Design a protein around this ligand. Structure first.
Ligand SMILES: CS(=O)(=O)c1ccc(-c2cnc(NCc3cccc4c3CCO4)n3cnnc23)cc1
Length: 350
């Protein structure tokens, strides 16, 4: 990788999120979104390192702080859609062509730390909050499918979550140092999702009833000794990090235990490896994988970018000195974008 371009957003506030749109066809524009302050900005990647500013969404509330964004598509037209959330705990659905807000979802009792769309169902949106819960939404029928939390749920702010390859299960993590498994391929959850597609408030005077999931399918506090701020699936394995200068690769149960045989009472975990690095010991720093799950990237608090081939390289620039909060690979893995605390954007081309 070589640094081909850099720019700074006029708001001069930290950028906490970056996502390339992985739903665009070959020959169609290479687009990424950035989130910082009360803003969402779209950019296009052109040849010779050129970055073109497309459009910006400025929220009506000046005190809103966006922390996360995620792309999806309309199941009928295949047209792109962009979800955003942050400090106000309100999910906003944006039309990326006009950059106008289509609709919003109110419900979480505090800020939203992450948004993730289901890998097979573009209408299923997962949100994780400072209110100690996760929420699953159906954005086609505007319904709250389920709430994940309660007695055996997270005991502090939830920081991250990820669906597995097929979207049969979710792994969540947060300030309570725990990593929790939630199965969504159970008879209960499959019927709840089916019911959410049948609901229409105009054909009944009764509200839609959400599932209250009080108990996870697995839980551990034996991987990290501080806040767990990023979690991703790698097949049946889990990659997770704290502020302890390492990404840990692990699995529930003993070495030969199958993930779908794991019981909620499982007391063991198996450590399979660790990715070591330096000067990334502050809270709120995300790692990312490319679409192929062949590359892993993580930025540090002094502007250094670490890249590992999963089948270590350190990327530096004399003008890049601020903390890299999140990175994103283009679908073909030829471009890597990094966003920083000083509102700067960095483009690395393979
Ligand atoms: C410059 S400062 O004032 O020191 C500062 C620093 C961090 C935050 C902050 C960032 N991000 C989130 N949530 C999203 C999140 C969650 C997990 C990992 C992760 C991210 C974004 C990158 O990595 N926050 C929730 N509450 N505060 C924050 C706010 C102010």
């Amino acid at each position: 990788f070589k640094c081909v371009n850099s720019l700074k957003e006029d708001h001069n506030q930290p950028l906490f999120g970056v996502q390339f749109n992985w739903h665009s066809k070959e020959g169609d524009p290479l687009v990424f979104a950035t989130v910082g302050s009360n803003r969402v900005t779209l950019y296009e990647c052109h040849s010779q390192g050129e970055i073109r500013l497309l459009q910006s969404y400025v929220d009506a509330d000046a005190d809103e702080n966006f922390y996360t964004c995620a792309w999806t598509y309309d199941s009928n037209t295949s047209h792109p859609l962009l979800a955003v959330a942050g400090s106000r705990g309100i999910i906003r659905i944006i039309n990326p062509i006009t950059m106008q807000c289509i609709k919003h979802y109110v419900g979480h009792g505090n800020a939203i730390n992450e948004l993730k769309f289901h890998p097979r169902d573009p209408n299923l949106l997962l949100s994780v909050s400072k209110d100690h819960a996760l929420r699953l939404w159906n954005i086609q029928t505007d319904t709250l499918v389920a709430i994940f939390g309660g007695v055996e749920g997270h005991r502090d702010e939830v920081l991250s979550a990820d669906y597995d390859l097929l979207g049969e299960k979710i792994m969540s993590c947060g300030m309570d140092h725990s990593l929790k498994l939630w199965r969504i391929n159970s008879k209960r959850m499959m019927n709840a999702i089916k019911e959410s597609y049948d609901y229409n408030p105009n054909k009944t005077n009764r509200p839609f009833i959400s599932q209250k999931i009080h108990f996870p399918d697995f839980s551990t506090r034996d991987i990290h000794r501080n806040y767990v701020d990023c979690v991703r699936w790698l097949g049946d394995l889990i990659l997770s990090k704290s502020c302890e200068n390492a990404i840990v690769c692990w699995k529930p149960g003993k070495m030969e235990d199958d993930i779908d045989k794991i019981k909620p009472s499982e007391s063991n975990v198996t450590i399979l490896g660790r990715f070591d690095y330096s000067q990334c010991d502050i809270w709120y720093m995300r790692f990312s994988m490319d679409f192929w799950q062949k590359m892993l990237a993580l930025g540090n608090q002094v502007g250094k970018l670490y890249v590992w081939d999963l089948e270590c390289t350190t990327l530096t620039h004399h003008k890049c000195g601020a903390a890299i909060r999140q990175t994103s690979f283009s679908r073909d893995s030829s471009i890597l974008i990094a966003v920083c605390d000083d509102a700067s954007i960095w483009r690395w081309d393979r």
